[PDB]
Structure formats: structure tokens, C-alpha cells
Design a protein around this ligand. Structure first.
Ligand SMILES: *[C@@H]1O[C@H](CO)[C@@H](O)[C@H](O)[C@H]1NC(C)=O
Lengths: 48, 40
């Protein structure tokens, strides 16, 4: 399901968790913070 | 038929632009199948 086309939910603000079409990913601000907190260890998938 | 993915270099399968319910999981969002002559 596509994101809502218009935003008149009645006062509720969902821009905090909805994706922002400004970065190469569809991650919102909360998702970006959560990704930034925990750090991986596999270091990608390619090591020649 | 050399193809480059984020899981490795794939040799022996041609690359297309469509998207179906994938058959054999390769990895990193890439799958493979046996289709039509006959090839992978
Ligand atoms: C191949 O090396 C180049 C850097 O020259 C890089 O763009 C690319 O990430 C490497 N291949 C993969 C699958 O990461």
C-alpha cells in the first residue's frame, strides 16, 4: 500500500515515522536512529 | 553471462529486468529460476 497522498488525519502528525522521499532508502527518522545505534560486525558482504 | 550482485559474481545466468515471485534464493534480494531457448 502506497503512503497516504494527502495529510489531513485530524491533527495527528505522522511525519515522524513515515518514510521521507529524500534519501536513497525509504527509512524514516526513527528507523535511521535505530540503525545508527547498533553497529554490525560482518563489515559488508564483499572482501576480495 | 557475467552478472554482478552484492552477494558475489554470478556466472552462467543471464540478467533480466522483470520481477516475479522468485524461485531459487541467491541472496541480497536476488533470486534465480529456469526459464526460456532454455536457460537460467
Ligand atoms: C568492486 O570494487 C568497486 C570499487 O572499485 C566497488 O564499487 C564495488 O563495491 C565492488 N563490488 C561489490 C559487489 O561491492
Amino acid at each position: 500500500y502506497k503512503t497516504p497522498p494527502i495529510k489531513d488525519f485530524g491533527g495527528f502528525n505522522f511525519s515522524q515515522i513515515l518514510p521521507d522521499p529524500s534519501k536513497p532508502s525509504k527509512r524514516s527518522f526513527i528507523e535511521d536512529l535505530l540503525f545508527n545505534k547498533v553497529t554490525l560486525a560482518d563489515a559488508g558482504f564483499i572482501k576480495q | 553471462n557475467v552478472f554482478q550482485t552484492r552477494a558475489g559474481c554470478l556466472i552462467g545466468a543471464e540478467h533480466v529486468n522483470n520481477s516475479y515471485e522468485c524461485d531459487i534464493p541467491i541472496g541480497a534480494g536476488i533470486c534465480a529460476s529456469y526459464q526460456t531457448s532454455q536457460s537460467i
